[PDB]
Write an enzyme that holds these catalytic residues in place. Structure first.
Site, PDB file in Angstrom:
ATOM      1  CG  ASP A  35      -3.134   0.528  -2.447  1.00  0.00           C
ATOM      2  OD1 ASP A  35      -3.996   0.740  -1.558  1.00  0.00           O
ATOM      3  OD2 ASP A  35      -2.608  -0.599  -2.667  1.00  0.00           O
ATOM      4  CB  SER A 199     -15.439   3.339  12.733  1.00  0.00           C
ATOM      5  OG  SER A 199     -16.799   3.731  12.753  1.00  0.00           O
TER       6      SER A 199
END
Length: 330
Positions: A35, A199
């Site tokens: 994770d 992004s």
């Protein structure tokens, strides 16, 4: 040193991925959920409330000649999905894909919430976010990656998740045969303890690319792709019959649809998520309404590049002094 381990979907929808981990002496192999959005390595164990174990493989510290109770240490964690676990702490030898750390904090669950109990395929989690998020008290503990770092040929690990197929986690090296083109690297903020990046925008299907900054985290421990409501609305508007359902808890769409792809920007590069990756199947057995793999992050408080996004790429988690993220197509 290096390590290399195969990671396998737990079910036909890729709801999560498990990776075999050797703990203790002799080895006890447990299948853990790697994770990058958390920083505790915890396991089902011989100490876990009996009624809360249902088919998982357990770590038994008393059977490991290298296990030592970390005296006084406890842990307690709650995840973004509302699940939780807690217990005490041992140090032991932990190996992943041939890579061995001695003295790793292994967090032994005394209690787990129902969603963990109900998932017999996941024996625990292995956190790969930054160690600042580790919940061990009163002495915070380092992640597996942090402990291995100095020994690694290169201070990196890579995530190569499969679509409906096994993939790979590598430690200490970049497999140049595992991706196409170049790797595009982008800056990381560690201020929230996550692999947090920005992004450069998105496209829906064959639509034109929208340049816009989207801050989010690269999180292997989250199944879906969680983005701003504007973006998600723009995506699902291209699917006939798609709608947001509060009763189901997100966007659903007719199972008869063909989904469009979704592109996200990494600097000047582009990662394309095929439309099939965004189909998570009937909301209930036999239903003709299917659950969407792109969902709104509104009310999460953060955008999450989960498995839906990451499995479309070869992803480099660069833990050099100035951490960065790299993405390549594959």
């Amino acid at each position: 040193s290096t390590g290399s381990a195969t990671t396998t979907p737990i079910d036909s929808l890729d709801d999560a991925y498990i990776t075999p981990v050797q703990i203790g002496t002799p080895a006890q192999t447990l299948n853990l959920d790697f994770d990058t959005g958390s920083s505790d390595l915890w396991v089902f164990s011989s100490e876990t409330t009996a009624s809360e174990v249902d088919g998982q493989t357990i770590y038994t510290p008393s059977k490991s000649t290298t296990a030592k109770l970390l005296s006084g240490a406890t842990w307690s964690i709650s995840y973004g999905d509302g699940s939780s676990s807690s217990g005490d702490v041992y140090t032991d030898t932990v190996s992943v894909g041939g890579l061995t750390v001695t003295g790793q904090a292994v967090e032994s669950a005394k209690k787990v919430s129902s969603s963990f109990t109900e998932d017999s395929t996941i024996d625990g989690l292995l956190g790969l976010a930054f160690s600042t998020l580790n919940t061990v008290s009163p002495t915070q503990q380092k992640t597996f990656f942090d402990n291995a770092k100095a020994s690694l040929d290169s201070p990196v690990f890579t995530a190569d998740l499969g679509y409906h197929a096994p993939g790979t986690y590598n430690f200490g090296f970049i497999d140049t045969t595992a991706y196409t083109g170049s790797i595009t690297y982008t800056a990381v903020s560690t201020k929230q303890g996550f692999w947090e990046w920005t992004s450069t925008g998105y496209a829906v299907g064959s639509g034109t690319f929208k340049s816009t900054s989207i801050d989010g985290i690269a999180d292997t421990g989250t199944t879906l792709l969680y983005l701003p409501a504007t973006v998600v609305s723009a995506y699902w508007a291209q699917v006939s019959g798609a709608k947001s359902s509060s009763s189901v808890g997100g966007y659903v769409f007719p199972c008869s649809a063909t989904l469009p792809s979704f592109t996200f920007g990494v600097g000047s590069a582009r990662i394309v998520i095929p439309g099939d990756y965004i189909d998570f199947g009937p909301i209930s057995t036999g239903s003709s309404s299917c659950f969407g793999g792109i969902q709104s992050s509104a009310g999460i408080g953060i955008n999450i590049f989960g498995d839906v996004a990451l499995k479309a790429a070869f992803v480099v988690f660069n833990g050099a002094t100035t951490p960065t993220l790299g993405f390549a197509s594959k």
